[PDB]
Design a protein around this ligand. Sequence first.
Ligand SMILES: NC(=O)c1ccc[n+]([C@@H]2O[C@H](COP(=O)([O-])OP(=O)(O)OC[C@H]3O[C@@H](n4cnc5c(N)ncnc54)[C@H](O)[C@@H]3O)[C@@H](O)[C@H]2O)c1
Ligand SMILES: NC(=O)c1ccc[n+]([C@@H]2O[C@H](COP(=O)([O-])OP(=O)(O)OC[C@H]3O[C@@H](n4cnc5c(N)ncnc54)[C@H](O)[C@@H]3O)[C@@H](O)[C@H]2O)c1
Ligand SMILES: NC(=O)c1ccc[n+]([C@@H]2O[C@H](COP(=O)([O-])OP(=O)(O)OC[C@H]3O[C@@H](n4cnc5c(N)ncnc54)[C@H](O)[C@@H]3O)[C@@H](O)[C@H]2O)c1
Ligand SMILES: NC(=O)c1ccc[n+]([C@@H]2O[C@H](COP(=O)([O-])OP(=O)(O)OC[C@H]3O[C@@H](n4cnc5c(N)ncnc54)[C@H](O)[C@@H]3O)[C@@H](O)[C@H]2O)c1
Ligand SMILES: NC(=O)c1ccc[n+]([C@@H]2O[C@H](COP(=O)([O-])OP(=O)(O)OC[C@H]3O[C@@H](n4cnc5c(N)ncnc54)[C@H](O)[C@@H]3O)[C@@H](O)[C@H]2O)c1
Ligand SMILES: NC(=O)c1ccc[n+]([C@@H]2O[C@H](COP(=O)([O-])OP(=O)(O)OC[C@H]3O[C@@H](n4cnc5c(N)ncnc54)[C@H](O)[C@@H]3O)[C@@H](O)[C@H]2O)c1
Lengths: 288, 289, 288, 289, 289, 288
Amino acid sequence: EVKRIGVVGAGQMGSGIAQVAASAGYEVVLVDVAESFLERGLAAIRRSLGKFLEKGKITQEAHDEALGRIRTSLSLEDLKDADLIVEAIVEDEGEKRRLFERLGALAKPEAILASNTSSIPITALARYSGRPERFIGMHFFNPVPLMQLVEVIRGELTSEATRDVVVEVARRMGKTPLEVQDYPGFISNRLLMPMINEAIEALREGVATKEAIDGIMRLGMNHPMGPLELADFIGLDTCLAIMEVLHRGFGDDKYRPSPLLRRMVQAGLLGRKAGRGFYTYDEKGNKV
Amino acid sequence: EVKRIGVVGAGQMGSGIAQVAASAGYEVVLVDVAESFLERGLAAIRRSLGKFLEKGKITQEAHDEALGRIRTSLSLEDLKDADLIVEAIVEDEGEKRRLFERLGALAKPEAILASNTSSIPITALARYSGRPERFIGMHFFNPVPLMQLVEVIRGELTSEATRDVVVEVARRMGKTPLEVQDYPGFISNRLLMPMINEAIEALREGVATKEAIDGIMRLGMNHPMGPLELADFIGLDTCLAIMEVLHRGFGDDKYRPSPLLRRMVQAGLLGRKAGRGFYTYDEKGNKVG
Amino acid sequence: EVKRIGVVGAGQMGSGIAQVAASAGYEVVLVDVAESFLERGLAAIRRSLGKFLEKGKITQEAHDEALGRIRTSLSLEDLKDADLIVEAIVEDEGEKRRLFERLGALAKPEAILASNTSSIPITALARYSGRPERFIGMHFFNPVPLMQLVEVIRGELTSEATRDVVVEVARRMGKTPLEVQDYPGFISNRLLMPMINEAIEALREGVATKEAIDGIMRLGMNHPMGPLELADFIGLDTCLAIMEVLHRGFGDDKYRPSPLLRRMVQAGLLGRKAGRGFYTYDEKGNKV
Amino acid sequence: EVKRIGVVGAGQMGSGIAQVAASAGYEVVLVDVAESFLERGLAAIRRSLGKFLEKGKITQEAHDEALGRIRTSLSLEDLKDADLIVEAIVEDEGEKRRLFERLGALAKPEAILASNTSSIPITALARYSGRPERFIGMHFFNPVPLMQLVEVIRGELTSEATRDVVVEVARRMGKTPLEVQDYPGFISNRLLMPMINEAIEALREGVATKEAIDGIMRLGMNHPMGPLELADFIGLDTCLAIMEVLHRGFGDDKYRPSPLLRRMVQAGLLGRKAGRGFYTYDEKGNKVG
Amino acid sequence: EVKRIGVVGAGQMGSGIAQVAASAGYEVVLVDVAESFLERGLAAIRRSLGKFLEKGKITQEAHDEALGRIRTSLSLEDLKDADLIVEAIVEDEGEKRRLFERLGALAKPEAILASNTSSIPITALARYSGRPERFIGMHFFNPVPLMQLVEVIRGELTSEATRDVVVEVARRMGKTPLEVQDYPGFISNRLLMPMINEAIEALREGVATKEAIDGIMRLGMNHPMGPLELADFIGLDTCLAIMEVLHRGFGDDKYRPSPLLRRMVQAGLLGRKAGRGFYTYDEKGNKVG
Amino acid sequence: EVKRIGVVGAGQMGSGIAQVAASAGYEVVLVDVAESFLERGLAAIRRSLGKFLEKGKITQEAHDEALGRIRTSLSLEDLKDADLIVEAIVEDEGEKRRLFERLGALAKPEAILASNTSSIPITALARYSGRPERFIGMHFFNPVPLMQLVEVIRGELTSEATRDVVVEVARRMGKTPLEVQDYPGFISNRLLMPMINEAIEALREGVATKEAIDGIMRLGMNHPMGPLELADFIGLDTCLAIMEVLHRGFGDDKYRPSPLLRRMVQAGLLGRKAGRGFYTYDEKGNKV
Ligand SMILES: NC(=O)c1ccc[n+]([C@@H]2O[C@H](COP(=O)([O-])OP(=O)(O)OC[C@H]3O[C@@H](n4cnc5c(N)ncnc54)[C@H](O)[C@@H]3O)[C@@H](O)[C@H]2O)c1
Ligand SMILES: NC(=O)c1ccc[n+]([C@@H]2O[C@H](COP(=O)([O-])OP(=O)(O)OC[C@H]3O[C@@H](n4cnc5c(N)ncnc54)[C@H](O)[C@@H]3O)[C@@H](O)[C@H]2O)c1
Ligand SMILES: NC(=O)c1ccc[n+]([C@@H]2O[C@H](COP(=O)([O-])OP(=O)(O)OC[C@H]3O[C@@H](n4cnc5c(N)ncnc54)[C@H](O)[C@@H]3O)[C@@H](O)[C@H]2O)c1
Ligand SMILES: NC(=O)c1ccc[n+]([C@@H]2O[C@H](COP(=O)([O-])OP(=O)(O)OC[C@H]3O[C@@H](n4cnc5c(N)ncnc54)[C@H](O)[C@@H]3O)[C@@H](O)[C@H]2O)c1
Ligand SMILES: NC(=O)c1ccc[n+]([C@@H]2O[C@H](COP(=O)([O-])OP(=O)(O)OC[C@H]3O[C@@H](n4cnc5c(N)ncnc54)[C@H](O)[C@@H]3O)[C@@H](O)[C@H]2O)c1
Ligand SMILES: NC(=O)c1ccc[n+]([C@@H]2O[C@H](COP(=O)([O-])OP(=O)(O)OC[C@H]3O[C@@H](n4cnc5c(N)ncnc54)[C@H](O)[C@@H]3O)[C@@H](O)[C@H]2O)c1
């Protein structure tokens, strides 16, 4: 039944989702708002599939056939016969709302619509879609070709059938789909971001240096990255937005953002992407 | 310096601290309250040093010399000339208080006293010791011979000199000492335990199953253990006690224990050590069913 | 501006290109698909530099410093910061196309990409690269350490700046760069291969023996090798592929391969590398 | 006298023989029937010499010089001036016969011809060669670069001089040549294979499990591999073929193949190379329980 | 349930079985027919335990306690309350029969009787014992303190319970018990001895020298000893007796002893113990000439 | 303060000294006069570290890191920043003199120079170095990775500081440094070689056979090797050279070489390395 997958957004996540869908044997249409963004997206797909081929993880045939199953477009109308459309556009409720109203109008009636959103309520996006029973969260992990997890998020009205289809797509993509209810932060961000926020509060209070905090979590807890270097990697603007969703969604002070996180974002010290957050980065990323 | 190290408590942590001190070239006196506990402790040390020798991490000489530098005793008086005494007894403020009053009285004036406590304020233990400028937290990670971290916790009155001595001992033990202020949860537990507590709240609220929660944190965040299986490993009684220290010490509802964590502890479902917490364990401590 | 040169293919030509780049003072990253091929390539570089040292063409210092400037790698991503990348992989348009799509995606924007291709249109490879203004033919001659010529081939879109950079690299390598337009056979193969093909036709027609044909061209025209022994040296499969490129590219019967050349290739009589073409060879490649 | 060695067959054994000949300082011409087979052969030689280099058994120079002494060819005529030609082609008497008739015709008169055959009579191959006095068995052990033994097998007509030359080549290859007469199974297969066959019969009779049989021979007799896991390693088709040579060559029921060995081969349960014999193997050739 | 072990025969094997039983924590009564034999037996036990102590494989305490658990006796009646009695007397069916009839009469009803026999059918000895369900083969390997293997041999009537008890005793002795059915040669001798016999036949036929035969099996097959030097080590009289058991028990010419093996035994060339078999030995048992 | 160790001579001793320095955590530069000698040296280091790894005496990490700390070179100038340089070249005073004059000129002023010489006076080599207070004997035992002893030899002018640094390096190498004054034969050779020489004289005089002499010293005195088999192991040329240094240095006939030792050396019967001395050896160096 699922043969054709639409992906909206050829960014960090959408280009990975398009790749894993194509590698699984699905026909893929990847949509964005400018040719330059589509080109940047297929460049990321060629680099990733290229590494899989180089290290003997896939054959020449599978490499070339996967690329052959990806078509790019500037036109949402080219998703009219997709069985599943995965949205991976900017993390902005207004933008996703306008997209899902359009997708609800043009997608064939049996098409499932899915969001890769980190933080926006699945139930709200489901209402904007006009087909809430055929709406679900399909939350991938960065970078998509390397991360086995899909967090599958049921909206209030998500049907059993919708969940079964998306769980099977994840399995065909070589992923482990784990199901969660639509509450603020789902599981992934609800568990991760308050610990990062607590590290930032400990830093503000002078409990320890950034090096001591990151070293304690790496060496003591075997986290691959400490929370402050991880915040820099995610982006401090993204960290703040997720803490605000927890604070506003639970309505509980428990989830208040660190005032130092607010201050860093006001300063534009947004992490690796700005060349500076808690640490300073050179042009390649790497700390200095 | 420091030539002679006392370790009080030949348990899970103290037997590891004794081993790493001995392997570093320090003379060690390991003290407990019964011969059976000392025997269990040196059995753990022989098993660990045995594995290091077998895998070529140490020589026969270093293996034999390390064991040769460890003496056991039932008498605190045998610590009278220790340069550093590390306490690793039961996590109970009253017990540690009575021990530190005794150690303050009998240890030579220049001796530094240290606690491996997970949660009890270093500043309070420092006052009980009678020598707060020569008191410090020296917080090791389980299992001590394998975990490179020492969290070094300054009490209000801990001197620069005391910190310098203990940081150097940790380096000679092959550890990375990272310094933290004496506030509830230090860094390690303040960051870890509220995330475990949040996983337990998500489970109570029906947001996901225990398998989905642990799988998401393992696969998504590359945590070696998910928070619920980790809670079982630490002990749910220990998890609840640390959340209570954060709640009482910060005085902030932010750190309130999950009602499900309280209920599990009331039921005696304490994790691996009880054969059941979030998961069920066999006699070897592996999941079953 | 050019400090770092990538070479893809540690074969007959790529190992020579890597050597002359290293001897010229450039940092070299030499890439192939297996460690054994890289080892075989640096063994050829050590043998050649060893002969240059023995005959007093270079000093011990220059010998050791040249080897010191060559790193081998199985990862194309190690060419991310190369100023110039020269491709010397198998003569197959599909293989080169997939390589150049990958190189275009991973190389820094200012990097120039070049092909050592004998026959494949530079303008086509330039399109596959995604950066045609920064694409050029850089055609070396076998064996690269000994042959002074570089044939520099402008694609339709090759910039003046790209040509200037590659002409300067050739000069720093001690080579004479001579410029040609991207048309079938360039100059080198367009002039050489139809004369070899004509010798094969004269042989098929019974006009003379192979010895008479090669002797006439050696003694009469002062060619170092007659065309039939030269065909055996190049490989009859390579001769046929070049004649096919001339025939298909000009679309002109003038350039039709000799039916005897087709027949020899069907028989696997490919020349020196098969132990037999027009002549019979021993294991060392001498006539018997 | 021996400067130039021909090897026919760039397979498992021939590529090893070529390598050890080249490492010993001989010029080697390695012959096969297709370029792909020659490429596969020199790939195996580069991998092995690469490991010798990595472990400090040889220098970069000796590595490069050894490879420099190996030339490949599709033409038997290129063996016209070889002093010694060692055949390591398919174990098929007809194929070896056609090869040895050709080699006898083209090799210079003083050239010695040798077979690596496991089981075909040396005396018969010697007759096919047309120079039986200059024919001998030179039986190497898998893998050739690692195994010190050469079993040197005299045909009925093999001269003293032929034996002396081949014994000296084996010594220059760093091998221990041990001399045997041309009778079925020589020594190696005559002694080994009937014991493997007996283990298979004991298994068929229900005397013990495969694990008990292999464990008894490993622990009791200090054999590195038990006979059933060894049969799987050799290939049950090869084990059956060698038992048939003993049975037909001695003409004695003493050497009859186990009916269970026949049945396993009829089923295609050939051992490691088929993914299953007595034991089951994964793609890497390790057992799975 | 097994606390007390009887061993009958204080020879090469019985003194080893007594030692490993004592080292495992069992009370041991070691019986023979003369004081000199008992003295020779405990001398071998002191030498072996002495070497374990010197090399630090055991403590002084364990050394002294093991010797303390061994009593010697000339009276079978001293086995009246043994839980397990292991026979290790001369390899003679008549002698073992008379012993087992006596042991069946005097041993307490729940006592298990076991034979270390190399070759005599377990089922026959079981019948002589009068308690076949409580009879089993417990076949140790020379020298017992060093060899991990026990071959456990079920008689036709041996109970599951008897097998379970003897397998557990072997494990407490630090051994690996591997189970086999009572058929001629069990597994160990059925697999080993026909290959030794074949080496002797190849030698008689002039296929190769003794050095070539032993060298081929050492270097080619990674056997620690070649079959001819191994035959000398075992004793050629023992080799012939085991081949006779295979020949008579299977009733199959396949297992006929080599005529050269018979001739060597007729000449008294019995191997190391006679100073000459296939090889010549000095008084220390090293090859000479 | 000692971080970087130079070793000159990649022979039997120098390759062992380089290995033990690298295993102790020092950065090592190993120098010789030809590539083949450096290759033979690192082959011996790989074989030795390989055996330590195989028998579980070291970890994979320690094995790989030790090899990673060794660089080879044909240029003494690469020792310009060594803290300690240990010479282990040919036992020839003229060669060591020319080396130490060069090392004195190029090594940084605080660098200590040490000789592994068996027999040449430390005080003389110290004068050739131009920095006698920073010169010392550091005499290792064959084979270096297995032998715990370092004989530390004070020249007339060797400073306390120089001795302290070299004693500490020996301890970090896992060795037991024992201090001796610079007089002929130091302690090791002064005690050992006259007893070997006496065994040779007893053999020449027909007092006993070589087997009786070696058996008496093994069984009676618990020497692991008898003096004649030991002479074969050391090399009879080395034994003679050491006896000559005792004879010429003390100026005392007491230390005259056995005429049979001179005769054996004149015949080239040098011991294991020649396949024959007092005993005959196979290619593996076992008696025959
Ligand atoms: N980056 C992460 O690690 C990560 C992880 C999980 C989930 N997410 C979520 O995935 C989504 C995408 O994030 P990203 O990191 O890939 O962002 P990105 O900026 O890399 O990509 C966003 C893409 O969407 C395109 N786009 C914007 N508006 C559009 C519209 N109206 N129609 C079509 N295309 C439009 C942009 O041009 C761009 O190509 C967000 O909701 C984010 O919260 C991010
Ligand atoms: N984060 C954690 O996992 C955690 C939690 C709580 C406390 N701890 C800390 O770890 C250390 C001990 O924990 P463990 O897991 O090793 O425990 P354990 O119970 O295995 O060992 C403690 C040892 O102390 C001995 N002991 C008790 N009272 C004593 C006394 N008065 N004098 C001497 N010995 C005495 C006990 O007999 C026992 O051998 C303490 O410093 C404790 O504060 C660990
Ligand atoms: N050989 C000549 O005389 C000659 C003359 C001039 C031009 N050329 C051209 O140069 C090119 C190479 O020729 P050659 O003779 O060196 O061939 P070759 O077969 O010797 O070498 C090709 C190498 O490329 C490697 N390779 C293949 N695909 C690869 C990939 N994707 N990435 C990295 N390495 C890869 C192969 O493993 C091999 O080592 C061809 O385009 C040929 O037409 C050849
Ligand atoms: N593999 C072993 O363990 C082993 C042990 C000892 C002896 N042997 C014997 O060595 C010989 C080779 O065995 P292998 O395992 O190397 O086999 P293999 O199949 O790996 O190699 C045989 C090679 O011979 C080539 N070949 C076949 N017919 C040929 C012909 N007529 N002329 C030229 N080349 C020809 C094939 O192309 C192949 O490359 C056999 O006689 C075998 O019995 C094998
Ligand atoms: N020697 C081996 O390698 C070996 C291997 C395994 C099994 N076995 C078997 O073990 C048994 C013992 O062999 P061994 O090598 O110890 O022999 P042994 O001759 O060394 O010991 C036999 C002992 O039994 C005693 N003995 C004889 N008759 C007796 C009797 N009626 N009552 C009590 N004691 C008596 C003898 O006095 C002697 O002390 C034999 O059945 C033999 O086949 C021996
Ligand atoms: N071999 C022993 O058992 C032993 C014992 C202790 C001391 N020593 C002493 O150690 C020194 C080394 O002896 P060895 O056995 O290692 O000798 P070796 O011949 O094995 O090694 C000497 C190395 O020095 C190199 N060399 C020669 N001149 C050189 C120069 N000018 N610069 C750099 N390298 C140069 C040679 O090429 C060779 O690789 C001698 O002084 C010897 O007396 C030897």
